[PDB]
Design a protein around this nucleic acid. Structure first.
Lengths: 158, 144, 114, 56, 139, 99
RNA sequence: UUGUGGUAGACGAGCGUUGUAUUGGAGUUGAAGUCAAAGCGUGAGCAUUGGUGGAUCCAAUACAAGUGAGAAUGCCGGCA
RNA sequence: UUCUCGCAGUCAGACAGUGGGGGAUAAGCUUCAUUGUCAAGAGGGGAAGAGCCCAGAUCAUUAAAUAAGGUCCCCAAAAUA
RNA sequence: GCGAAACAGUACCGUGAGGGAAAGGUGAAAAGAACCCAGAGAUGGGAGUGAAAUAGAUUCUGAAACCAUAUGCCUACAACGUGUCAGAGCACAUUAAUGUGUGAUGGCGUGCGUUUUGAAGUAUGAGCCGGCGAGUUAUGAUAGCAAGCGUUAGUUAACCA
């Protein structure tokens, strides 16, 4: 700010009887000294609060609009466990299911280690828990693969 | 929109005339002199190319004023020096220099533009009875 | 996000300077002067877009009177003989350039006499 | 005193309109292959006939 | 055919060398050195050496006649100037500006090529017009 | 021969095979239109207007005139109002005007 | 049909820049900037083309602004 | 042009006709009231003008009929008696 | 951007407290130009390397005020805020567009901002040019608009994950 940079507290010129301007100080916002009058400060909140009912209603609406399409499919423990730590098997899976270009996200209730071992070197796939996913990411996928278990919990939380 | 009104293309043609003022008055002679200079009565006038004619007036001495203008009105000329007011009367010019009177009056007829310095070269006035302008074959006419 | 903002100033100044072309002195190079010059030029254009429609009408009347004084009658009398008798809404610039087609205006001149 | 309104390039150019250098007359010496001045002697030392200055 | 000889930061003012540029322009090679080497100005003397070097370059490298040339164009270009400070009365200093000059000269062989640059400009604008025409037939 | 037409509120003389320019008449392109408001045909004088006389002509092309940028500036009183304007016109020639 | 002069001023409708979020595209067959050109809007502005240049930009929707210069006897830098 | 409400800015006026005060019925004076202009209003006339006299400029048009004012020319327009 | 991207609290201003600068970029790699011509030399023109030498040691991009040279046109009887509307002539042909540059000639024509009862001012602010150069932010209140929830409604703060 104006009074935080080091400079001169003494006027370079006397106020009058000088051919140049009235202003005297070396770090005004009108010199080459910095000192911007108005600007960002390191205390900005950058956050906005929403009522919890509205947020859960938005989550429910997004879930309802995304479960009513053929793009998504149901996924269970079977193909999570049948694949090894190798990521190539899941690539062959995606090629078979032609979901390569889709930014499919895995939503899982059990937090399986076999699935989460893979998918970490692809910009398109990532594994998250039910409580971890938000409204945004859930609609960023363009393709959903949901656990069979999460239906009951989603109904319970509405 | 517009019909593109026609202007001449510097196809200026002039004629010569003789007007022997015998009992004319200065103002009514000067108005028609300017009329002939600017070609006001000609059907082909535009101000941008000086559509005019030539005017030669003879026997300038014989033009007569009216009323008591002879001894009352004064003609003034100024020299840029101090007190240089050349003041004359009508009867003085009418005997000494009569062409100057009509010359100044006609120069008073024309607008103070860049054509007046070319409009005034079109008039020729002579104090006496003879002129050397008998080389263009003009046509005589009165009251103009 | 600190903003530099360089393109806008350049494009605005170039656009303003391009308008005032063929200008005396430095008035076609200094943007600060060029804007004032184009302001005054466009104001003159605004006033002249009516001044010219008036001045043309003035020259219109003048050149009609020039032709009509040759027939020994008055221009106002000609407008009169158009309006009250032998009703004619004939165009003035029409009858003006009908001087250019020879003697065809004389038909209208002789027609006003019933 | 000082000037009130800035003199543009026009004023300076019309002022310098008469400042150009005029050429000086030249002549050829009879036994000196040089383009020397008029009524003068060049670097070889002859005004023509009479000699006067060193060769160089 | 140009056969120019450039020079960079001579210790001379622009106008003074410009004067001898008007002085030299319009004459051939034979009647240039003689008139240049007698003017009592120090701006002309450097131009004489530069013109001699240009003459040598033209005669050697580009290989024209070397006896049918004439000076074509002389510049007085303000080169990178210099700034110093000068004392004055009562401690009111001023900035003295030492002027520079970028003096170059060009030679021509024919009474033409003053129009060949114009011809090349016409070719350039013609190629611009042709490039515009090419896009008009892409519909 | 020579003829006279009026369009909108502006009047024009017309010569055969001669073009002239008027405001947009809201007409299709390339057809022959037969204007009614004709006045003072060759040696045929209708005092209010010409009786049962029409002038036929084919429109050549629609066009836009030179750009006119009118700017309103009150002197030293915080005013820089601007406006642009062009003129949609029709260029047309006559072929067979009938008495 | 009624109107459309306009500062102080209320109020409505929009453009532009930077960055980010995605969705598409261009790019050593040549981007941006910049030079000039006789383009297109009601406007802030937006195109096309040739030369300069050898690495980043563009289009549509949103969001956040060190954000749009003619003046402050300005300040830095250059130049009459 | 009344009511409820959001949100301003204005607290130095000038001018002309008229009705009055201070001034000596002197001001381009001051101070009040009343009708209009200017502040924030371009155009035309008044030769040159914020206030005077005509009226409300969206723009383009080389298109008509008028207001105040003028018709010898400058500078568009007229004469008859 | 910290005043300091570079041998910055240095250079410098001061006797001293202290005040306190500016500037970085060739090219992929010096491959930094052997050698020749002019000149004393700096240097330039060449040749040579290199895709490029208009990348040449002044070393990325190179526009403004500025100053020169050149095509086409115009000016030396002209009262001029220098522009605008008509306008002949002249030389060219374009982002094909009632086209472009120049403008002899006629009509009209007292700048831009600020402050002001009042501006071209014999008040003021600017020499030009390029860059920087002011309505935001934190915490609360009021009022409009919009959204969610709603008949015992609505609602989370700090804090933990």
């Amino acid at each position: 700010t104006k009074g935080e940079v080091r400079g001169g507290g003494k006027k370079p010129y006397k106020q009058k009887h000088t051919g140049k301007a009235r202003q005297g100080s070396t770090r005004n916002p009108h010199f080459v000294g910095g000192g911007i009058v108005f600007g960002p400060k390191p205390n900005r909140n950058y956050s906005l609060k929403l009522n919890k009912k509205a947020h859960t209603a938005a989550l429910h609406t997004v879930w309802s609009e995304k479960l009513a399409s053929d793009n998504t499919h149901l996924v269970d423990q079977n193909l999570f466990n049948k694949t090894e730590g190798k990521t190539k098997v899941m690539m062959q899976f995606l090629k078979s299911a032609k979901l390569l270009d889709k930014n499919v996200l895995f939503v899982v209730n059990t937090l399986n280690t076999n699935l989460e071992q893979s998918t970490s070197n692809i910009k398109n796939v990532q594994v998250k828990h039910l409580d971890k996913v938000s409204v945004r990411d859930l609609m960023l996928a363009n393709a959903l693969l949901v656990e069979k278990e999460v239906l009951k919990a989603l109904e319970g939380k509405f | 929109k517009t019909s593109m009104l026609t202007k001449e293309q510097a196809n200026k043609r002039r004629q010569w005339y003789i007007v022997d003022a015998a009992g004319l008055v200065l103002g009514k002679l000067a108005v028609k002199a300017a009329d002939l200079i600017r070609g006001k009565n000609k059907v082909d006038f535009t101000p941008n190319q000086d559509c005019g004619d030539y005017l030669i007036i003879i026997n300038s001495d014989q033009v007569v004023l009216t009323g008591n203008k002879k001894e009352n009105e004064f003609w003034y000329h100024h020299s840029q020096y101090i007190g240089g007011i050349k003041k004359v009367s009508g009867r003085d010019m009418l005997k000494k220099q009569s062409d100057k009177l009509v010359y100044n009056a006609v120069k008073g007829m024309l607008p103070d533009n860049r054509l007046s310095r070319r409009w005034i070269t079109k008039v020729h006035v002579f104090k006496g009875d003879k002129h050397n302008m008998e080389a263009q074959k003009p046509t005589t006419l009165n009251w103009s | 996000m600190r903003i530099k903002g360089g393109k806008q100033t350049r494009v605005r100044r170039k656009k303003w300077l391009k308008q005032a072309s063929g200008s005396f002195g430095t008035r076609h190079a200094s943007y600060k002067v060029a804007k004032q010059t184009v302001i005054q030029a466009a104001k003159y254009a605004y006033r002249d877009r009516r001044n010219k429609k008036r001045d043309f009408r003035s020259l219109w009347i003048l050149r009609l009177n020039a032709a009509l004084r040759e027939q020994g009658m008055t221009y106002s009398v000609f407008i009169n003989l158009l309006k009250k008798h032998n009703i004619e809404i004939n165009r003035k610039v029409l009858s003006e350039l009908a001087i250019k087609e020879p003697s065809k205006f004389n038909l209208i001149v002789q027609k006003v006499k019933s | 005193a000082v000037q009130q309104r800035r003199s543009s390039k026009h004023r300076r150019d019309k002022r310098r309109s008469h400042d150009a250098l005029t050429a000086q007359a030249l002549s050829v010496c009879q036994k000196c292959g040089k383009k020397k001045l008029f009524h003068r002697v060049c670097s070889c030392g002859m005004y023509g006939d009479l000699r006067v200055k060193k060769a160089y | 055919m140009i056969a120019f000889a450039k020079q960079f930061r001579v210790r001379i003012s622009p106008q003074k060398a410009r004067l001898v540029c008007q002085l030299i322009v319009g004459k051939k090679t034979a009647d240039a050195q003689n008139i240049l080497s007698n003017t009592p100005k120090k701006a002309a003397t450097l131009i004489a050496k530069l013109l001699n070097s240009a003459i040598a370059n033209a005669t050697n490298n580009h290989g024209m006649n070397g006896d049918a040339l004439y000076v074509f164009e002389c510049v007085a270009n303000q080169g990178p100037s210099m700034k110093r400070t000068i004392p004055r009365a009562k401690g009111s200093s001023n900035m003295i500006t030492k002027r520079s000059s970028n003096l170059v000269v060009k030679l021509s062989d024919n009474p033409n090529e003053r129009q060949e640059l114009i011809k090349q400009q016409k070719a350039l604008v013609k190629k611009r017009v042709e490039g515009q025409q090419k896009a008009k037939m892409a519909r | 021969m020579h003829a006279i037409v009026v369009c909108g509120s502006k009047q024009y003389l017309v010569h055969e095979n001669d073009t002239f320019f008027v405001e947009k008449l809201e007409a299709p392109v390339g057809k022959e239109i037969q204007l009614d408001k004709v006045l003072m045909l060759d040696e045929k004088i209708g005092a209010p207007y010409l009786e049962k006389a029409r002038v036929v002509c084919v429109v050549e092309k629609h066009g836009l005139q030179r750009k006119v940028n009118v700017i309103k500036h009150i002197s030293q009183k915080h005013h820089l109002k601007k406006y642009g304007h062009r003129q949609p016109y029709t260029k047309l020639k006559v072929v067979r005007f009938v008495h």
